[PDB]
């Protein structure tokens, strides 16, 4: 509940902790990972997973 990111591409799952999205999907940042571009956000479904920023855009 803060920053919202939008998926540009349809990147599948790469890590058990990572969560796939569909271009146009919005995700909310919940926490940041050891890496920058790499950020952990949740879905509107209440799902929690990490997503590559290089695959999405942060409106914030």
């Amino acid at each position: 509940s803060g920053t919202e990111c939008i998926a540009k591409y349809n990147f599948h799952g790469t890590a058990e902790q990572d969560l796939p999205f569909c271009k146009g999907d919005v995700l909310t940042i919940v926490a940041v990972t050891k890496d920058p571009n790499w950020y952990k956000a949740k879905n509107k479904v209440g799902r929690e997973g990490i997503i590559p920023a290089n695959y999405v855009q942060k409106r914030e």
């Binding site: 790469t14 902790q17 990972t33 050891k34 890496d35 571009n37 790499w38 920023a53 290089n54």
Partner: peptide, 18 residues
């Protein structure tokens, strides 16, 4: 080949207490 996402570090399991 396009630019692949960032390296998948396991440290992700830890959240920095910014």
């Amino acid at each position: 080949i396009p630019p692949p996402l960032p390296e998948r570090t396991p440290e992700s399991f830890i959240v920095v207490e910014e």
